[PDB]
Amino acid sequence: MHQDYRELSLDELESVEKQTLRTIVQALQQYSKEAKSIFETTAADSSGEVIVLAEDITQYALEVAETYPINRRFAGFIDYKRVRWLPSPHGLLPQVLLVDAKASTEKNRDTLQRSQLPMDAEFRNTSSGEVVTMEAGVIPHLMLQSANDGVLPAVTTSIFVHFYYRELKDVEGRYRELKSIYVLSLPHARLKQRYNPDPDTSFFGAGKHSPARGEVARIRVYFDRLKEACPWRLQELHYSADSEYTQPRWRDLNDAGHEVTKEFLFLER
Amino acid sequence: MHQDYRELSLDELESVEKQTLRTIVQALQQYSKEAKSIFETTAADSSGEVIVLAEDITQYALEVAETYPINRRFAGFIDYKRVRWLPSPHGLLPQVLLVDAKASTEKNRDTLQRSQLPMDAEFRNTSSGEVVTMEAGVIPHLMLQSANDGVLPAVTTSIFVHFYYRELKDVEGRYRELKSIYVLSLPHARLKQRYNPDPDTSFFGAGKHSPARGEVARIRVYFDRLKEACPWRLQELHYSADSEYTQPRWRDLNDAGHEVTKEFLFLER
Amino acid sequence: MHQDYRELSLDELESVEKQTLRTIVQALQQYSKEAKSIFETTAADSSGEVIVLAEDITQYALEVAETYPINRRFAGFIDYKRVRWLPSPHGLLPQVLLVDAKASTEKNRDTLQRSQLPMDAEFRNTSSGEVVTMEAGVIPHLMLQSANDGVLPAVTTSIFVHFYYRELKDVEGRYRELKSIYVLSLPHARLKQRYNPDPDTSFFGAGKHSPARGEVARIRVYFDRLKEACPWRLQELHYSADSEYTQPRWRDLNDAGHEVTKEFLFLER
Amino acid sequence: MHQDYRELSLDELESVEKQTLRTIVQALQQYSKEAKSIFETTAADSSGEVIVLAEDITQYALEVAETYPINRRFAGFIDYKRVRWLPSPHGLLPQVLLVDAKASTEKNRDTLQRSQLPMDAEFRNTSSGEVVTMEAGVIPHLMLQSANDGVLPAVTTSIFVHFYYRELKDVEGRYRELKSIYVLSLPHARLKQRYNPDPDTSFFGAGKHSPARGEVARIRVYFDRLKEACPWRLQELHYSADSEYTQPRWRDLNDAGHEVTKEFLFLER
DNA sequence: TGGCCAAC
DNA sequence: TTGGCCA
DNA sequence: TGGCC
DNA sequence: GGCCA
DNA sequence: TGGCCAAC
DNA sequence: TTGGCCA
DNA sequence: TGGCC
DNA sequence: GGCCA
Ligand SMILES: [Ca+2]
Ligand SMILES: [Ca+2]
Ligand SMILES: [Ca+2]
Ligand SMILES: [Ca+2]
């Protein structure tokens, strides 16, 4: 086994992330009933609410699905974060789970600060035709001080929880409608060559703000382009009208390479 | 990626047991210092005090290294037990962790009531020369009620924390010496053929019970055989004089199959 | 507002014990349903199974109702134990909660090893007619190392969860009936004069031990006397047929001093 | 005892709040060493950081000093919040602990949204000479659904953690300096007549933004005016240069009415 | 109640 | 290892 | 203390 | 939640 | 090892 | 109630 | 998909 | 994180 992720094959590393996301999708799924009641029937306080409501729900849902805590903390801008040990066949890996909640009226892509970017981005602006850039503001790991030695790198695992919804303003006791909770597992920096080797191959899009062409502040991530590069990295728990809880569907791919989506079992929580 | 353990290949099942052990071994290691202090300096009361010190030190070391808790509890003679979700590449598997603490003066073998026996056992009693047979008393899985369908089987994982020590003529604040902590990982039933195909092929042995006095019968497991059966299923956190913590050693079985050992990193806790 | 319990008036000390009991009573109440299910339907193994079911059900009910944890653990024959901070008007007091579980067939009195005895006891053995004397085996407080000075005494609070039941001829999935749960709050030493000033004035009595066979000696406490000594120190969660939960009753002693009982509210858990 | 705060005398209610704050001051004090290292040596990310860093530290400090959790949650704008049972001599009270972190360059007063206002405010604008108003956006309680009945009111307890600091921009590995962590316990709505009976008696000040005279959006709270109306409601843990941790000082008043400040004991945490 | 004996 | 059962 | 940006 | 009156 | 007897 | 001690 | 407010 | 091209 290994204690240093850097001693892991890109594939093995990928499983850590895959492994981390599946757990997270269980927590959300099992929190869906309540997630929806809170998201929809919480006060209005003049817009902005949803921003909070998202991070709030994402935490009330994941804090109960955690693992072996590590005695190290850090303040950052990512609405949710826990340093911990993550049991794995590749070895008990020290990990830093970073996850940010988002609320949007859109169902494809979402914006992010340099401080949320797992890897160095580089895409090509449609109109412009020129290359845009953004260094990653998120570290690859957080060195931990061994007791029997020195620093041990706790890997950084990035996850995004997008709450796609629609305004309704306010009916009886409902002010809006949660439609689906999308979940994304953004690949680690070490995996750059795979998901973003050059500007003509990448799930990153044009920022949303004044500047365009060359280096930029903001950026985007398009769900479709990510899924196509790897199906399990785009999870989606959708609310039909048959269940109070979302539709427990998990996207992956069989051992023939065909992307498949299966329905899993969840508990009352 | 599998929720039902039965859908797992045999090697994989092994894998969740091994990642389960590695996590417990770590939890113990990071507590071995306090473990020593509590085990050697705790005042003996009506003797048999080694009993409860083993149970207690075990709970404390592990209760801090748990994972995604599932809302189901047990009530039995098992020392430490928790139902929960165990994340892993093979899927987020529901699991009943069963750890039994043992205060022992012998660094070889270990005793088991039948309710602690994972698989159906069969061995050849040397003294008598015959053949002994014990039926596993531990359920393969505990069924959970699915919030959205059938029942979900919770794998049963058996671990044994064996505290090797020796009494001592009180000197300092010490009353006895904790030589080392052995952590055993007994294989789940589905593995029966790989570890106990026939009577002569097993790691079991005569039980510490007295048939003459007509006692119900128990069975034993012998570290040496167990280790040969599978290196990682027998771990030993040995206390030395270099540090106050057990020496951080973990044995695995080389990429090619030969037994190997390594020193690992651990945090102060 | 006081950190050292010794600086507390006698009435106040009582107060932290009573608020400690009320919290445990609630924790139990909200678990009485599962408590019943586990206690009556759990398959008997080598009998004496009522023992571990009492311990287990107790831990589960209370382990969920704790407070500000302090970084210090015990190792002894006490069933449930946690060092911690207990908030209150009288100050944030450090405290060693000591709860012992008992599986009993009698709704009167309760047995105590000496290591469970809070104060020095003295009573008048009726059969012999003489006078019996037992020295408390429970420390008044556990000293903690101050990060900024001296040591800080952690009050010792003794609670007893007594499970009253009767065996039964297996019928449904039932093997025995849990009639009710009695929760006792024994007073801390500093209260000795108020509860056991002289031998004839006490709530103790002969111990369940056999002196003839030369057994070490234990002592008993008799609910009836205890209750008269102080109403709230004896609580009873009785199981009825109206609901699956114990009937939510809590007895206190009226503003003027007369005993009073009330039905309280509890959550589903 | 009582389960409904509304059955409590304003004084008793005040003790709940007093009791809640003292615990919180212990958590912060015991987190001071780390609180400071994080606050000061965390990245710059171009201002705003401190805003986050404050709530972050306030949570890493308090989440470990919690009590008996209640199975109810709610998303709001207050950076920290937990519904729970709070042991008290007045009875086990269901409580909703609301606490907001703030970071400021000032050491007196701090701004707040209607959504952070515990009680209806009303002061008199200096210049203007006219009365200003603001309804309280924070509810007095959150009804909980009894299992054996109906709604049970979980009291709302408001607390403010102001991290007074000073910019330094960036030296070696320090970018700013935390000087003191002030803590405030804002009185419940039921206590309005006491701390704010009319506009000429109140710790509230003029908002900070365009509008002035008559009803307003924002508002202020001046530490001095609050302390003078009640000494324990203004706690301050200050960093001198003798200790890594703040100066463990608690402000209260003896049972002669003289405000006194004492030094308490804290653990390593 | 008090105490013996029991299978833990 | 704490507890039933007996007088 | 105020309200401004 | 800065800066300045 | 295997098994008895022990004080839990 | 699980474990020491003995051959 | 882009950048605008 | 809205709105619109
Ligand atoms: Ca966000
Ligand atoms: Ca055991
Ligand atoms: Ca007990
Ligand atoms: Ca704030």
PDB file of C-alpha atoms in Angstrom, chain A residues 21-174:
ATOM      1  CA  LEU A  21     -17.760  10.805  -4.985  1.00  0.00           C
ATOM      2  CA  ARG A  22     -19.891   7.653  -4.664  1.00  0.00           C
ATOM      3  CA  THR A  23     -20.017   8.139  -0.908  1.00  0.00           C
ATOM      4  CA  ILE A  24     -20.967  11.778  -1.391  1.00  0.00           C
ATOM      5  CA  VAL A  25     -23.775  10.805  -3.781  1.00  0.00           C
ATOM      6  CA  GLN A  26     -25.147   8.493  -1.082  1.00  0.00           C
ATOM      7  CA  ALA A  27     -25.187  11.279   1.491  1.00  0.00           C
ATOM      8  CA  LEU A  28     -26.990  13.645  -0.863  1.00  0.00           C
ATOM      9  CA  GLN A  29     -29.424  10.980  -2.032  1.00  0.00           C
ATOM     10  CA  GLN A  30     -30.258  10.106   1.538  1.00  0.00           C
ATOM     11  CA  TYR A  31     -30.662  13.757   2.347  1.00  0.00           C
ATOM     12  CA  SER A  32     -32.777  14.536  -0.717  1.00  0.00           C
ATOM     13  CA  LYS A  33     -36.146  14.469   1.027  1.00  0.00           C
ATOM     14  CA  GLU A  34     -35.040  17.041   3.585  1.00  0.00           C
ATOM     15  CA  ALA A  35     -32.696  18.802   1.142  1.00  0.00           C
ATOM     16  CA  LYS A  36     -35.705  19.703  -1.004  1.00  0.00           C
ATOM     17  CA  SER A  37     -37.971  20.819   1.829  1.00  0.00           C
ATOM     18  CA  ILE A  38     -35.303  23.177   3.107  1.00  0.00           C
ATOM     19  CA  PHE A  39     -34.197  24.487  -0.279  1.00  0.00           C
ATOM     20  CA  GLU A  40     -37.728  25.176  -1.413  1.00  0.00           C
ATOM     21  CA  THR A  41     -39.580  26.217   1.749  1.00  0.00           C
ATOM     22  CA  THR A  42     -36.899  28.396   3.352  1.00  0.00           C
ATOM     23  CA  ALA A  43     -37.477  32.172   3.690  1.00  0.00           C
ATOM     24  CA  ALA A  44     -36.842  34.582   0.803  1.00  0.00           C
ATOM     25  CA  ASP A  45     -34.708  37.296   2.466  1.00  0.00           C
ATOM     26  CA  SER A  46     -34.511  38.959  -0.972  1.00  0.00           C
ATOM     27  CA  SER A  47     -32.534  36.655  -3.304  1.00  0.00           C
ATOM     28  CA  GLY A  48     -29.052  35.346  -2.531  1.00  0.00           C
ATOM     29  CA  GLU A  49     -30.597  32.849  -0.089  1.00  0.00           C
ATOM     30  CA  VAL A  50     -30.104  29.872  -2.380  1.00  0.00           C
ATOM     31  CA  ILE A  51     -26.368  30.571  -2.347  1.00  0.00           C
ATOM     32  CA  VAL A  52     -26.305  29.846   1.389  1.00  0.00           C
ATOM     33  CA  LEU A  53     -29.055  27.189   1.386  1.00  0.00           C
ATOM     34  CA  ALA A  54     -26.858  25.187  -1.000  1.00  0.00           C
ATOM     35  CA  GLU A  55     -23.699  25.075   1.123  1.00  0.00           C
ATOM     36  CA  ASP A  56     -25.871  24.569   4.185  1.00  0.00           C
ATOM     37  CA  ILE A  57     -27.675  21.522   2.790  1.00  0.00           C
ATOM     38  CA  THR A  58     -24.429  20.129   1.332  1.00  0.00           C
ATOM     39  CA  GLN A  59     -22.973  20.121   4.818  1.00  0.00           C
ATOM     40  CA  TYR A  60     -25.947  18.777   6.702  1.00  0.00           C
ATOM     41  CA  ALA A  61     -25.808  15.968   4.191  1.00  0.00           C
ATOM     42  CA  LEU A  62     -22.100  15.156   4.068  1.00  0.00           C
ATOM     43  CA  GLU A  63     -21.025  15.740   7.652  1.00  0.00           C
ATOM     44  CA  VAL A  64     -22.835  12.554   8.545  1.00  0.00           C
ATOM     45  CA  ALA A  65     -21.137  10.551   5.754  1.00  0.00           C
ATOM     46  CA  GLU A  66     -17.573  11.275   6.855  1.00  0.00           C
ATOM     47  CA  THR A  67     -14.576   9.055   7.714  1.00  0.00           C
ATOM     48  CA  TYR A  68     -11.602   8.710  10.123  1.00  0.00           C
ATOM     49  CA  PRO A  69     -10.850  12.353  11.060  1.00  0.00           C
ATOM     50  CA  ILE A  70      -7.330  13.795  11.058  1.00  0.00           C
ATOM     51  CA  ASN A  71      -6.279  16.387  13.629  1.00  0.00           C
ATOM     52  CA  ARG A  72      -5.604  19.144  11.115  1.00  0.00           C
ATOM     53  CA  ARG A  73      -7.792  21.986   9.850  1.00  0.00           C
ATOM     54  CA  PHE A  74      -7.634  24.961   7.533  1.00  0.00           C
ATOM     55  CA  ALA A  75      -9.752  27.967   6.665  1.00  0.00           C
ATOM     56  CA  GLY A  76     -10.444  28.492   3.008  1.00  0.00           C
ATOM     57  CA  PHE A  77     -13.146  29.706   0.672  1.00  0.00           C
ATOM     58  CA  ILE A  78     -14.554  26.289  -0.139  1.00  0.00           C
ATOM     59  CA  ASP A  79     -17.818  26.099   1.815  1.00  0.00           C
ATOM     60  CA  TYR A  80     -17.017  22.549   3.000  1.00  0.00           C
ATOM     61  CA  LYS A  81     -13.763  20.825   3.905  1.00  0.00           C
ATOM     62  CA  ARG A  82     -12.414  17.993   6.057  1.00  0.00           C
ATOM     63  CA  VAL A  83      -8.874  16.561   6.345  1.00  0.00           C
ATOM     64  CA  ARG A  84      -9.079  12.828   7.028  1.00  0.00           C
ATOM     65  CA  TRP A  85      -7.854   9.305   6.398  1.00  0.00           C
ATOM     66  CA  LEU A  86      -9.650   7.504   3.553  1.00  0.00           C
ATOM     67  CA  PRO A  87      -9.514   3.693   3.661  1.00  0.00           C
ATOM     68  CA  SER A  88      -8.539   2.312   0.280  1.00  0.00           C
ATOM     69  CA  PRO A  89      -6.993  -0.860  -1.185  1.00  0.00           C
ATOM     70  CA  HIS A  90      -4.092   1.310  -2.392  1.00  0.00           C
ATOM     71  CA  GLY A  91      -3.498   2.073   1.281  1.00  0.00           C
ATOM     72  CA  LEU A  92      -5.031   4.308   3.951  1.00  0.00           C
ATOM     73  CA  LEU A  93      -4.648   7.663   2.218  1.00  0.00           C
ATOM     74  CA  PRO A  94      -4.612  11.004   4.051  1.00  0.00           C
ATOM     75  CA  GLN A  95      -7.098  13.170   2.116  1.00  0.00           C
ATOM     76  CA  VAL A  96      -8.475  16.691   2.131  1.00  0.00           C
ATOM     77  CA  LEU A  97     -12.059  16.608   0.919  1.00  0.00           C
ATOM     78  CA  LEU A  98     -12.934  19.969  -0.630  1.00  0.00           C
ATOM     79  CA  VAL A  99     -16.491  20.545  -1.824  1.00  0.00           C
ATOM     80  CA  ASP A 100     -18.290  23.691  -2.867  1.00  0.00           C
ATOM     81  CA  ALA A 101     -22.028  24.158  -3.145  1.00  0.00           C
ATOM     82  CA  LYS A 102     -23.571  26.153  -5.963  1.00  0.00           C
ATOM     83  CA  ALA A 103     -27.094  27.247  -6.832  1.00  0.00           C
ATOM     84  CA  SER A 104     -28.014  28.112 -10.414  1.00  0.00           C
ATOM     85  CA  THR A 105     -30.975  28.590 -12.737  1.00  0.00           C
ATOM     86  CA  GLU A 106     -28.968  26.746 -15.394  1.00  0.00           C
ATOM     87  CA  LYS A 107     -28.473  22.974 -15.758  1.00  0.00           C
ATOM     88  CA  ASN A 108     -25.145  22.922 -17.615  1.00  0.00           C
ATOM     89  CA  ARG A 109     -21.831  24.272 -16.335  1.00  0.00           C
ATOM     90  CA  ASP A 110     -21.155  26.619 -13.432  1.00  0.00           C
ATOM     91  CA  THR A 111     -18.647  29.369 -12.650  1.00  0.00           C
ATOM     92  CA  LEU A 112     -15.664  29.108 -10.285  1.00  0.00           C
ATOM     93  CA  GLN A 113     -12.874  31.214  -8.710  1.00  0.00           C
ATOM     94  CA  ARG A 114      -9.194  30.472  -9.157  1.00  0.00           C
ATOM     95  CA  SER A 115      -9.548  29.364  -5.541  1.00  0.00           C
ATOM     96  CA  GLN A 116     -11.825  26.521  -6.651  1.00  0.00           C
ATOM     97  CA  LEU A 117      -9.773  25.418  -9.679  1.00  0.00           C
ATOM     98  CA  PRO A 118      -8.178  21.972  -9.042  1.00  0.00           C
ATOM     99  CA  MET A 119      -5.965  22.108 -12.139  1.00  0.00           C
ATOM    100  CA  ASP A 120      -4.397  24.693 -14.435  1.00  0.00           C
ATOM    101  CA  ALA A 121      -7.054  25.545 -16.994  1.00  0.00           C
ATOM    102  CA  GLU A 122      -6.533  26.456 -20.657  1.00  0.00           C
ATOM    103  CA  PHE A 123      -9.254  26.573 -23.289  1.00  0.00           C
ATOM    104  CA  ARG A 124      -9.927  28.435 -26.516  1.00  0.00           C
ATOM    105  CA  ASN A 125     -12.459  31.278 -26.557  1.00  0.00           C
ATOM    106  CA  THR A 126     -15.169  30.771 -29.185  1.00  0.00           C
ATOM    107  CA  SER A 127     -15.426  34.250 -30.709  1.00  0.00           C
ATOM    108  CA  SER A 128     -11.876  35.385 -29.890  1.00  0.00           C
ATOM    109  CA  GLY A 129     -10.232  32.236 -31.263  1.00  0.00           C
ATOM    110  CA  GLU A 130      -7.408  32.875 -28.811  1.00  0.00           C
ATOM    111  CA  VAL A 131      -6.288  30.794 -25.811  1.00  0.00           C
ATOM    112  CA  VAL A 132      -7.490  31.641 -22.291  1.00  0.00           C
ATOM    113  CA  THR A 133      -5.718  30.619 -19.089  1.00  0.00           C
ATOM    114  CA  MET A 134      -6.069  30.372 -15.299  1.00  0.00           C
ATOM    115  CA  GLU A 135      -3.657  28.882 -12.794  1.00  0.00           C
ATOM    116  CA  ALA A 136      -5.166  26.562 -10.220  1.00  0.00           C
ATOM    117  CA  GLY A 137      -5.770  28.245  -6.889  1.00  0.00           C
ATOM    118  CA  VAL A 138      -6.347  24.948  -5.086  1.00  0.00           C
ATOM    119  CA  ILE A 139      -3.266  23.143  -3.801  1.00  0.00           C
ATOM    120  CA  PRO A 140      -2.566  19.535  -4.805  1.00  0.00           C
ATOM    121  CA  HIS A 141      -2.094  18.555  -1.171  1.00  0.00           C
ATOM    122  CA  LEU A 142      -1.561  19.670   2.423  1.00  0.00           C
ATOM    123  CA  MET A 143       1.599  18.438   4.128  1.00  0.00           C
ATOM    124  CA  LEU A 144       0.904  16.827   7.508  1.00  0.00           C
ATOM    125  CA  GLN A 145       3.558  16.502  10.179  1.00  0.00           C
ATOM    126  CA  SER A 146       4.328  12.887  10.930  1.00  0.00           C
ATOM    127  CA  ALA A 147       4.933  11.951  14.560  1.00  0.00           C
ATOM    128  CA  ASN A 148       7.511   9.374  13.600  1.00  0.00           C
ATOM    129  CA  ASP A 149       9.149  11.534  10.928  1.00  0.00           C
ATOM    130  CA  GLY A 150       8.176  14.517   8.816  1.00  0.00           C
ATOM    131  CA  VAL A 151       5.594  15.749   6.327  1.00  0.00           C
ATOM    132  CA  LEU A 152       3.002  13.400   4.849  1.00  0.00           C
ATOM    133  CA  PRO A 153       0.963  14.737   1.901  1.00  0.00           C
ATOM    134  CA  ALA A 154      -2.812  14.701   2.377  1.00  0.00           C
ATOM    135  CA  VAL A 155      -4.265  14.651  -1.140  1.00  0.00           C
ATOM    136  CA  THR A 156      -6.706  17.297  -2.275  1.00  0.00           C
ATOM    137  CA  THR A 157      -9.939  15.893  -3.722  1.00  0.00           C
ATOM    138  CA  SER A 158     -12.267  18.463  -5.348  1.00  0.00           C
ATOM    139  CA  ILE A 159     -16.026  18.024  -5.619  1.00  0.00           C
ATOM    140  CA  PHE A 160     -18.802  20.336  -6.871  1.00  0.00           C
ATOM    141  CA  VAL A 161     -22.439  20.182  -5.817  1.00  0.00           C
ATOM    142  CA  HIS A 162     -24.620  22.177  -8.227  1.00  0.00           C
ATOM    143  CA  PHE A 163     -28.254  22.678  -7.165  1.00  0.00           C
ATOM    144  CA  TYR A 164     -30.089  23.363 -10.427  1.00  0.00           C
ATOM    145  CA  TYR A 165     -33.385  25.071  -9.604  1.00  0.00           C
ATOM    146  CA  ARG A 166     -35.962  27.530 -10.890  1.00  0.00           C
ATOM    147  CA  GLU A 167     -37.450  30.646  -9.285  1.00  0.00           C
ATOM    148  CA  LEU A 168     -41.200  30.660  -8.576  1.00  0.00           C
ATOM    149  CA  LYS A 169     -40.994  33.650  -6.261  1.00  0.00           C
ATOM    150  CA  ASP A 170     -43.521  32.406  -3.697  1.00  0.00           C
ATOM    151  CA  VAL A 171     -46.725  30.343  -3.592  1.00  0.00           C
ATOM    152  CA  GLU A 172     -48.320  28.857  -0.442  1.00  0.00           C
ATOM    153  CA  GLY A 173     -45.206  27.986   1.562  1.00  0.00           C
ATOM    154  CA  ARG A 174     -42.901  27.293  -1.388  1.00  0.00           C
TER     155      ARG A 174
END
